[PDB]
Amino acid sequence: LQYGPLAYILGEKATKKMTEKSKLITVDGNICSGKSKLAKEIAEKLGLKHFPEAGIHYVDSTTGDGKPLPVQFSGNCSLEKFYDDPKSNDGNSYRLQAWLYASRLLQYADALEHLLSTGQGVVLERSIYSDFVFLEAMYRQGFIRKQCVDHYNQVKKVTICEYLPPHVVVYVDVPVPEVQSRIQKKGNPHEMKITSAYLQDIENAYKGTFLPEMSEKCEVLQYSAWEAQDAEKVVEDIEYLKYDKGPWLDQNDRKLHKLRMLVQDKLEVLNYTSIPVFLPEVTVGAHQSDQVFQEFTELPGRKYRAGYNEDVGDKWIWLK
Amino acid sequence: MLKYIIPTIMLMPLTWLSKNNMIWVNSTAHSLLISFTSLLLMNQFGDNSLNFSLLFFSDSLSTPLLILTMWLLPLMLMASQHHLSKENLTRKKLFITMLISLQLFLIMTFTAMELILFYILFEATLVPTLIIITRWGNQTERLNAGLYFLFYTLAGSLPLLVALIYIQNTVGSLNFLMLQYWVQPVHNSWSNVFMWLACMMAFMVKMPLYGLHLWLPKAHVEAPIAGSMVLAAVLLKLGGYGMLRITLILNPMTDFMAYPFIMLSLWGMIMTSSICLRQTDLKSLIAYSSVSHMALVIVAILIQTPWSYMGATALMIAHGLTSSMLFCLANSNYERIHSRTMILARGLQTLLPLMATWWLLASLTNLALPPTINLIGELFVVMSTFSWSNITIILMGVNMVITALYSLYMLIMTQRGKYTYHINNISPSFTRENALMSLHILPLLLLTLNPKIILGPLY
Amino acid sequence: AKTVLRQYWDIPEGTECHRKTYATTSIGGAAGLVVSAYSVALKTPTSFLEGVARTGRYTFTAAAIGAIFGLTSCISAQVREKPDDPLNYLIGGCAGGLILGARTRSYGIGAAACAYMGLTAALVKMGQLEGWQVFAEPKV
Amino acid sequence: RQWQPDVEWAEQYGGAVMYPTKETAHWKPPPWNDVD
Amino acid sequence: MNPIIFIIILLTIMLGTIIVMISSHWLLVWIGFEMNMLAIIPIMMKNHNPRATEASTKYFLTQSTASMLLMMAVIINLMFSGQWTVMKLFNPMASMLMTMALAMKLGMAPFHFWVPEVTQGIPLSSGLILLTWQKLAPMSVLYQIFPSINLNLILTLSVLSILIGGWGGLNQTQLRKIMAYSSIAHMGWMTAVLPYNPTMTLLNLIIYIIMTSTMFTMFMANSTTTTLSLSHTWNKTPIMTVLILATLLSMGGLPPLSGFMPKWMIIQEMTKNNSIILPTFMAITALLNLYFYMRLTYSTTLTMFPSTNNMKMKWQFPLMKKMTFLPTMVVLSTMMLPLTPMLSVLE
Amino acid sequence: WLEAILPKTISLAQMKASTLVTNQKGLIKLYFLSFLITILISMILFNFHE
Amino acid sequence: DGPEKNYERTMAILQIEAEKAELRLKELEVRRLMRARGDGPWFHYPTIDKELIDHSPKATPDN
């Protein structure tokens, strides 16, 4: 059965599937900190599902055929444009950040849905709990207006409060000059235009705000670039955590049923990411919104609800 | 009437099941076939009306209005399809559906025997009309125009609902055939004064009566072209048709209750005609012209003589085709210059020769050139109001002078003089536009050869 | 309130002017008290004396309106010698309408109140003459 | 094009009330999720 | 809430109402109201926030006060007739108390102040129960005691409710407050016709329940609680805007929609009783409701309000809420006028 | 007559009446106090208890 | 349609409508009398059922 109260009444309870390995682990750090590699190793060693960092096209990867959609359907948010013209008048900077927060919010729901439905833990790369560091860095460099920050906090306030924090937070502390050296080595043309001040603000946001906050309710593990290479040691530390903090200890089948009822409904997950706060960076006028939506409905397998698209080979429509 | 109701309903699945690019071809072609069959309603007898069933009936009053109603739908479809070209397909189909549903309500409104059935359908026409104006109008003010249109009408119609229900309780029926035989005189009392007003004011707002007219210029300036055509050609005539029927049961009280409304209409027609001389918006000028013409209809209906009822019926038909034609002429300029200002584009006869002939013919019917049915109707009303009181000839005469002045002034300003130098997108007239104009004027002028079919039951 | 309306309607028209004004003023004055009561309850006055000032303000206006209506309406019937004519109360209604405009110092409100009060008062006389029921007893 | 509501037009319907008065000047829209 | 407990609490709400409608004894009627109130508080509190706590508290005080007045009327009736049978009362003072008690329960003006606040403070699904199912029990009692009801009192309550409901809704941007004032106005029509023809009270009640359930269901489908949130529906579910448009016009009493039928039939009954001024006044005052329904149609359906960039993410996910009975309810909300004579089944 | 029945004059009246109806403090104390006034005038002025 | 078909179709319509009008007027009169006198099946408001009364000898004799 599709999950709901009836399935819950018949035994589908989260505690019957969650073991001692049913942990949500998030890996955090600065740009070019090798967190992607460490996250991939923890999942393999621990037998957890790995979630790549949620980019602009994360939602595209979870719907339809899984392939990225043209950029107009993402709102023309561009990470490349952000580096070249961080203060552009089209409001690309905040529009990207608002879009990225929504993508992370969706990914966190996908992760929690996986954990609660199968009992298998997941590994994320950053999350909606640490997404603000980029917002703070953007604001401190003058890339976004103060009203943009207010909109971000309004959206974050009414969304993050629904979800539990990660069981484990793994922070990889790479000093800015080392990161500034690794960005140049990585040979990305646009990324090479980043400044240390922006990178320093990102680092300050983790240490000033993120890590102290998560310590109050999570198991926080910190490492350097060298200490991070030893994946076995990191996984050894994770397997020896106590778990005596945070709200995960107060959860029970009843509360997790309500949480699973939320995270499984993606439109309910995104309900408040589009509150009618008319802000120039994220506001789209009616004519552009109308015709872009019409184009979206014309994409293959997008006119009708999944399973009712003849143009992609669905069958038995007259009985579905 | 089912032979017209059902095919009209079938236009809806026809539009929705048509190929993507054949929505205009299919709906136009088949609504013309319906219009063709509407001539079978001409089986009118000299004593009895054509009484189909317990629900619907036609007589010489409703038949010409029914044919005008069914002829106007294909014309509204040709008029609309250009400015709706960039609309998405589903919204085009919904627009056509609103027009089809409006025709369905109208042909049922004009044929209902029972007056509450008339009331409901008479009221049902509000919904699609409002949707057309507010959804597919062009400018911001269309939301206010919808509100004025809705609440002017309801301020009058709700008292009518109370009065009709009161009448049925007392009389026992609202079937119009029964009311012809069971009608009793209305005796003087304050109760009957308000019963008279409740029975009439709803129709007066529709005409519209002078003083209750300010909603009409707003609606026309804001409505799309099809909205203007149906508004001017048929919707105003619901008030006239309602008054023509309900005055049966208001005698003899109408003898003195009419005076304030005759004074408003007799004076109102002169004021609205003079207003037309100073209007700057071409759609607003035509809207004021309609108020002036409908003022005669109100007077003719109120004085209740055979000649005036014949004049009222002929004027209602003639005005419908003329005013709808004028809006289409004004719209064709608008679709080129995107402005309703009358002085913006001048000397257009030099650039659009044939379209200037349509302007001339439309203006000649508006000023009622003999022997057009516009004059026949106006002349009959002038004859009957002279007997009502000889002095009225002065007011009628002055109005005919002013009517010629603004009719030709509109022609002279837009078509003659020197063309505006900087306007250089005046492309030649399309076949669609020329056909649209000629489908107004040709039936109008052909009716001159056989006027009796538009003179109503009193013929 | 039935009793107060009874003595007003018990008396003929254009007779005992001083009695009609007493009745209309009493009817109007009470309405100002009812309006005042809900006002102080639902909008707490700043001070006890502030509430008294508001109560007097509303009650005086309502009493004044009813006083003028009865005075003007009963004189008009007296001078015109037309006891059973709605136009008498049309004059009485507008008079009370103007007083409201004065008390509110708004010529626009006075004109608006004149029409609405004038028509309302005229309709009340027609209903009295022809037995219009507002709260009709069920019969069928 | 046909006119459609802009941001200014939309904000008429975004306040605590439709017709501001001196007595409601301090009112504020309730929280998006009803939580205070 | 545990799903099994939620079902049990919902059935207790229903059972409390049913007891009121099947009882021939005043004590059992009072017990039904007590049971119903006991089970309705948990569903108002089920999201645990201060606004929900305030709403439940304001609801409890109002309903508890009314139930005390109902019991006082029952005992006065017992003193002067020596029996408990649910029917006309045998003392005028008991009739006034019972009528005022039931007006308080229904939220009619001037006991109306709680309805906008309680509805605003509880979830949409709870508001749906509050403004629909909860009217059944008080109306079913009014249906049985109307012969002893003071005509002036009941018509005064009706007129004030139509005025207050109409005026209150003009100043609202919150969808739950709009529905609350819509409810107050509609209770006024139901009780105006009660002295003349109780069958038309039932007709108006049933039709009102259907349209109100339709609106609440469509608000839930999109999780909209504000006018501006509802103005985004065009860029997500265009069909829903058309359904909302039709339902609102029906609630406005426009022909040829179902919501015209109750206003039409009520006008007929009062005119048969030589009541002309009251129906005319009520119909005109009901244009106030039509105005702020039309305003919603303007921002929802007839114009396209500005959107937000993040809305594009919603395009990719289907509507997964149950929307139970919505296709049926919306069709009955709009297309029932041709079947109006069927109102005799209620006779 | 114009000032009385203009669209602007009718619209303002309802707008003014709406603010009177809706501008409330939200306090339990004031709403119930209004219930008390309602019951008293029901019996004292209108004799609804008879 | 020929003139005789329409003519006699009109008579059938008139007969039905005339009969309905008469019945409508009677119903208003019947309803008025039933409500005023309570001697008909309509407006029959319930009274206590006498089959609920206990007729057996009571504990004391005077009753």
Ligand SMILES: CCCCCCCCCCCCCCCCCC(=O)OC[C@H](COP(=O)(O)OCCN)OC(=O)CCCCCCCCCCCCCCCCC
């Ligand atoms: C028979 C007796 C009863 C008589 C009373 C009248 C009954 C009729 C009322 C029935 C109830 C309302 C249901 C109407 C069905 C509407 C469905 C429809 O026509 O299409 C909606 C349209 C489709 O949108 P969607 O499917 O999401 O995507 C389109 C891509 N192809 O959605 C859109 O594209 C949005 C278009 C923009 C919105 C345009 C709004 C104006 C058109 C509204 C028409 C409906 C008005 C209903 C009022 C009654 C009309 C008389």
Ligand SMILES: CCCCCCCCCCCCO[C@@H]1O[C@H](CO)[C@@H](O[C@H]2O[C@H](CO)[C@@H](O)[C@H](O)[C@H]2O)[C@H](O)[C@H]1O
């Ligand atoms: C913009 C419009 C605003 C609303 C307008 C509403 C008009 C409503 C009219 C009110 C009802 C008519 O007015 C009412 O008629 C009845 C008669 O049936 C009168 O009834 C009384 O008249 C006689 C006069 O001898 C008295 O002896 C006796 O007390 C009683 O019969 C009322 O004294 C009168 O107040």
Ligand SMILES: CCCCCCCCCCCCO[C@@H]1O[C@H](CO)[C@@H](O[C@H]2O[C@H](CO)[C@@H](O)[C@H](O)[C@H]2O)[C@H](O)[C@H]1O
């Ligand atoms: C919200 C305030 C709540 C306060 C509740 C206070 C308790 C009220 C007690 C009411 C009980 C007494 O109620 C009252 O008793 C007397 C005694 O026969 C009745 O009798 C009185 O009225 C009728 C009128 O024809 C006749 O019986 C008689 O002329 C007269 O004595 C009243 O009709 C009844 O209304």
Ligand SMILES: CCCCCCCCCCCCO[C@@H]1O[C@H](CO)[C@@H](O[C@H]2O[C@H](CO)[C@@H](O)[C@H](O)[C@H]2O)[C@H](O)[C@H]1O
């Ligand atoms: C004959 C019966 C007629 C029944 C008519 C139906 C009742 C309709 C009720 C509408 C009442 C509210 O209507 C409301 O009026 C005010 C006019 O001040 C408008 O308000 C507008 O004008 C006022 C000043 O004029 C400005 O201060 C305000 O900023 C502006 O928004 C509202 O935008 C409109 O929504």
Ligand SMILES: Nc1nc2c(ncn2[C@@H]2O[C@H](COP(=O)(O)OP(=O)(O)OP(=O)(O)O)[C@@H](O)[C@H]2O)c(=O)[nH]1
């Ligand atoms: N503006 C913005 N950029 C972001 C955000 N998340 C990632 N990015 C950018 O995405 C780019 C790549 O992300 P990173 O994972 O941090 O760098 P990486 O080299 O690819 O991954 P690792 O070296 O393994 O840590 C960086 O330039 C980031 O600045 C965000 O929330 N906001």
Ligand SMILES: [Mg+2]
């Ligand atoms: Mg990376």
